[PDB]
Amino acid sequence: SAMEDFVRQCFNPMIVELAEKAMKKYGEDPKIETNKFAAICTHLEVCFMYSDFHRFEIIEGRDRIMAWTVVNSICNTTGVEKPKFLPDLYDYKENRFIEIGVTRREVHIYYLEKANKIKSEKTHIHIFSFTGEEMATKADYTLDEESRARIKTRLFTIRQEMASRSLWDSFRQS
Ligand SMILES: O=C(O)c1[nH]c(-c2ccc(-c3nnn[nH]3)cc2C(F)(F)F)cc(=O)c1O
Ligand SMILES: [Mn+2]
Ligand SMILES: [Mn+2]
Protein backbone atom coordinates (compact mmCIF):
# COMPACT_ATOMS: atom_id res chain seq x y z
CA SER A 1 0.00 0.00 0.00
CA ALA A 2 1.24 3.52 -0.81
CA MET A 3 -0.27 4.93 2.43
CA GLU A 4 1.88 2.70 4.69
CA ASP A 5 4.90 3.72 2.55
CA PHE A 6 4.03 7.45 2.94
CA VAL A 7 3.61 7.09 6.74
CA ARG A 8 7.07 5.52 7.15
CA GLN A 9 8.53 8.15 4.76
CA CYS A 10 7.03 11.37 6.22
CA PHE A 11 6.78 10.53 9.97
CA ASN A 12 9.76 9.93 12.34
CA PRO A 13 10.27 6.25 13.42
CA MET A 14 9.31 7.00 17.06
CA ILE A 15 5.84 8.26 15.98
CA VAL A 16 5.47 5.35 13.49
CA GLU A 17 6.44 2.77 16.19
CA LEU A 18 4.10 4.24 18.83
CA ALA A 19 1.26 4.35 16.26
CA GLU A 20 1.89 0.73 15.24
CA LYS A 21 2.02 -0.27 18.95
CA ALA A 22 -1.34 1.42 19.62
CA MET A 23 -3.07 -0.35 16.69
CA LYS A 24 -1.26 -3.73 17.12
CA LYS A 25 -2.33 -3.86 20.81
CA TYR A 26 -6.01 -3.91 19.80
CA GLY A 27 -5.47 -6.45 16.97
CA GLU A 28 -5.38 -3.95 14.07
CA ASP A 29 -2.85 -4.24 11.21
CA PRO A 30 -1.40 -0.84 10.11
CA LYS A 31 -1.33 -2.56 6.68
CA ILE A 32 -5.08 -3.37 6.59
CA GLU A 33 -6.24 -0.10 8.27
CA THR A 34 -3.70 2.21 6.53
CA ASN A 35 -5.75 5.45 6.74
CA LYS A 36 -6.16 4.98 10.54
CA PHE A 37 -2.36 4.43 10.79
CA ALA A 38 -1.77 7.80 9.09
CA ALA A 39 -4.30 9.62 11.33
CA ILE A 40 -2.76 8.25 14.58
CA CYS A 41 0.72 9.31 13.32
CA THR A 42 -0.57 12.77 12.27
CA HIS A 43 -2.42 13.33 15.58
CA LEU A 44 0.55 12.15 17.73
CA GLU A 45 2.86 14.47 15.76
CA VAL A 46 0.51 17.42 16.53
CA CYS A 47 0.49 16.55 20.27
CA PHE A 48 4.32 16.29 20.42
CA MET A 49 4.70 19.56 18.44
CA TYR A 50 2.13 21.41 20.64
CA SER A 51 4.10 20.45 23.80
CA ASP A 52 7.37 21.89 22.40
CA PHE A 53 6.22 25.46 23.23
CA HIS A 54 7.94 22.96 30.68
CA ARG A 55 4.44 24.42 30.10
CA PHE A 56 3.04 21.11 28.78
CA GLU A 57 2.96 17.47 29.91
CA ILE A 58 2.27 14.86 27.17
CA ILE A 59 -0.32 12.23 28.27
CA GLU A 60 -0.80 11.02 24.65
CA GLY A 61 1.54 8.27 23.38
CA ARG A 62 2.14 6.90 26.89
CA ASP A 63 0.84 3.41 27.84
CA ARG A 64 -2.40 3.46 29.87
CA ILE A 65 -0.54 2.60 33.12
CA MET A 66 2.01 5.42 32.68
CA ALA A 67 -0.60 7.88 31.30
CA TRP A 68 -3.09 7.47 34.19
CA THR A 69 -0.20 7.63 36.71
CA VAL A 70 0.90 11.00 35.22
CA VAL A 71 -2.74 12.28 35.27
CA ASN A 72 -3.25 10.98 38.86
CA SER A 73 -0.01 12.67 39.94
CA ILE A 74 -1.02 16.01 38.33
CA CYS A 75 -4.56 15.79 39.79
CA ASN A 76 -3.36 15.08 43.37
CA THR A 77 -0.81 17.95 43.36
CA THR A 78 -2.83 20.56 41.36
CA GLY A 79 -6.25 19.63 42.84
CA VAL A 80 -7.60 19.62 39.25
CA GLU A 81 -10.60 17.25 38.90
CA LYS A 82 -9.66 13.79 37.53
CA PRO A 83 -10.78 13.51 33.84
CA LYS A 84 -13.05 10.54 32.93
CA PHE A 85 -11.16 10.13 29.61
CA LEU A 86 -7.34 10.14 29.27
CA PRO A 87 -6.48 13.64 27.86
CA ASP A 88 -3.65 14.53 25.40
CA LEU A 89 -1.71 17.32 27.19
CA TYR A 90 -1.69 19.27 30.49
CA ASP A 91 -0.98 23.04 30.45
CA TYR A 92 0.96 24.01 33.64
CA LYS A 93 0.65 27.79 32.99
CA GLU A 94 -3.16 27.73 32.50
CA ASN A 95 -3.39 24.72 34.92
CA ARG A 96 -5.79 22.66 32.73
CA PHE A 97 -5.86 19.39 30.73
CA ILE A 98 -6.10 19.77 26.90
CA GLU A 99 -7.71 17.52 24.24
CA ILE A 100 -6.23 18.03 20.73
CA GLY A 101 -8.40 17.13 17.70
CA VAL A 102 -7.32 16.89 14.02
CA THR A 103 -10.18 16.61 11.48
CA ARG A 104 -10.48 16.29 7.68
CA ARG A 105 -14.09 17.54 8.17
CA GLU A 106 -15.08 21.05 9.26
CA VAL A 107 -13.68 22.26 12.64
CA HIS A 108 -17.09 22.92 14.30
CA ILE A 109 -18.48 19.44 13.46
CA TYR A 110 -15.47 17.76 15.18
CA TYR A 111 -15.37 20.30 18.08
CA LEU A 112 -18.98 19.55 19.13
CA GLU A 113 -18.37 15.78 18.68
CA LYS A 114 -15.39 15.96 21.10
CA ALA A 115 -17.31 18.20 23.53
CA ASN A 116 -20.11 15.60 23.64
CA LYS A 117 -17.54 12.82 24.24
CA ILE A 118 -15.88 14.74 27.14
CA LYS A 119 -18.83 16.59 28.69
CA SER A 120 -16.12 17.68 31.23
CA GLU A 121 -15.84 21.47 30.68
CA LYS A 122 -12.61 21.34 32.74
CA THR A 123 -10.81 19.72 29.76
CA HIS A 124 -9.85 22.39 27.15
CA ILE A 125 -10.53 21.37 23.49
CA HIS A 126 -8.34 22.49 20.54
CA ILE A 127 -9.34 21.32 17.03
CA PHE A 128 -7.02 21.73 14.01
CA SER A 129 -7.86 21.25 10.32
CA PHE A 130 -5.68 20.39 7.31
CA THR A 131 -7.12 23.61 5.80
CA GLY A 132 -5.41 25.93 8.33
CA GLU A 133 -8.53 26.37 10.48
CA GLU A 134 -8.66 25.93 14.27
CA MET A 135 -11.44 25.94 16.92
CA ALA A 136 -10.75 26.02 20.69
CA THR A 137 -12.70 26.26 24.00
CA LYS A 138 -13.77 29.91 24.72
CA ALA A 139 -11.54 30.92 21.74
CA ASP A 140 -8.47 30.59 23.99
CA TYR A 141 -5.96 29.20 21.44
CA THR A 142 -3.28 28.65 24.22
CA LEU A 143 -0.19 28.75 21.94
CA ASP A 144 1.41 31.80 20.29
CA GLU A 145 0.47 32.57 16.66
CA GLU A 146 3.83 31.38 15.23
CA SER A 147 3.77 28.12 17.22
CA ARG A 148 0.13 27.46 16.06
CA ALA A 149 0.96 28.35 12.42
CA ARG A 150 3.81 25.80 12.42
CA ILE A 151 1.37 22.99 13.42
CA LYS A 152 -1.08 24.05 10.66
CA THR A 153 1.74 24.23 8.05
CA ARG A 154 2.73 20.60 8.81
CA LEU A 155 -0.94 19.52 8.59
CA PHE A 156 -1.36 21.21 5.16
CA THR A 157 1.97 19.68 4.02
CA ILE A 158 0.78 16.20 5.11
CA ARG A 159 -2.46 16.73 3.12
CA GLN A 160 -0.59 17.88 -0.02
CA GLU A 161 1.97 15.04 0.29
CA MET A 162 -0.93 12.55 0.35
CA ALA A 163 -2.57 14.35 -2.61
CA SER A 164 0.66 14.33 -4.71
CA ARG A 165 0.59 10.53 -4.14
CA SER A 166 -3.23 10.54 -4.81
CA LEU A 167 -4.04 9.31 -1.24
CA TRP A 168 -5.93 12.39 0.10
CA ASP A 169 -9.36 11.44 -1.34
CA SER A 170 -9.40 8.11 0.59
CA PHE A 171 -8.08 9.81 3.76
CA ARG A 172 -10.68 12.64 3.82
CA GLN A 173 -13.59 10.17 3.39
CA SER A 174 -12.35 8.04 6.36
O1 LIG B 1 -6.55 7.71 22.22
C1 LIG B 1 -6.78 8.94 22.13
O2 LIG B 1 -6.63 9.68 23.14
C2 LIG B 1 -7.26 9.54 20.81
N1 LIG B 1 -7.67 8.67 19.67
C3 LIG B 1 -8.14 9.30 18.40
C4 LIG B 1 -8.58 8.49 17.18
C5 LIG B 1 -9.78 7.82 17.22
C6 LIG B 1 -10.22 7.09 16.12
C7 LIG B 1 -9.44 7.05 14.98
C8 LIG B 1 -9.91 6.27 13.76
N2 LIG B 1 -9.87 6.70 12.47
N3 LIG B 1 -10.37 5.73 11.68
N4 LIG B 1 -10.72 4.72 12.44
N5 LIG B 1 -10.44 5.02 13.73
C9 LIG B 1 -8.24 7.74 14.92
C10 LIG B 1 -7.80 8.47 16.02
C11 LIG B 1 -6.46 9.21 15.90
F1 LIG B 1 -6.69 10.55 15.81
F2 LIG B 1 -5.66 8.94 16.98
F3 LIG B 1 -5.82 8.81 14.77
C12 LIG B 1 -8.19 10.82 18.27
C13 LIG B 1 -7.78 11.68 19.41
O3 LIG B 1 -7.83 12.86 19.29
C14 LIG B 1 -7.32 11.06 20.68
O4 LIG B 1 -6.94 11.89 21.74
MN1 LIG C 1 -5.62 11.35 23.13
MN1 LIG D 1 -6.73 13.92 20.74
Residue numbers in the entry: -1 to 51, 74 to 194
The authors write:
The E23K mutant in complex with compound 23 shows interesting changes in Lys23 and Tyr24 that have clearly defined electron density. In this structure, differences in pi–cation interactions involving the 2′-trifluoro-substituted benzene ring and subsequently the position of the 4′-tetrazole are impacted. The ring is rotated by 0.3 in this structure to maintain the pi–cation interaction in the new position of Tyr24. This rotation causes changes in hydrogen bonding in the 4′-tetrazole with Lys34 and Arg124. There is also a slight change in MBP coordination, causing distortions from optimal octahedral geometry. Changes to the binding affinity of compound 23 with E23K were smaller, resulting in changes to the binding angle and changes in hydrogen bonding. E23K was found to interrupt hydrogen-bonding and cation interactions upon binding of both BXA and 23. E23K incubated with 23 showed a ΔTM of 10.2 °C at 200 μM and 14.3 °C at 1 mM, ∼ 8 °C lower than with WT and 2 °C lower than the value obtained with I38T. This indicates the interaction between 23 and E23K is not as stable as WT or I38T. The difference between the ΔTM values for 23 with E23K and I38T (>2 °C) is relatively small, suggesting that binding of 23 to these two mutants might be rather comparable, which is consistent with the SpS experiments.
Baloxavir marboxil (BXM) and its active metabolite baloxavir acid (BXA) is a first-in-class inhibitor targeting the influenza virus polymerase PA N-terminal endonuclease domain (PAN) that was approved in Japan and the United States in 2018.6 The RNA-dependent RNA polymerase of the influenza virus cannot synthesize its own 5′-mRNA cap, which is necessary for eukaryotic translation. To overcome this, the polymerase engages in a unique “cap snatching” mechanism, in which the polymerase subunit PB2 captures host pre-mRNA and PAN cleaves 10–13 nucleotides to serve as a primer for viral mRNA synthesis by the PB1 subunit. PAN is a metalloenzyme that is essential for viral replication, is highly conserved, and is not naturally occurring in humans, making it an attractive antiviral target. Despite its clinical success, BXM has demonstrated susceptibility to resistance mutations, specifically the I38T, E23K, and A36 V mutants of PAN.
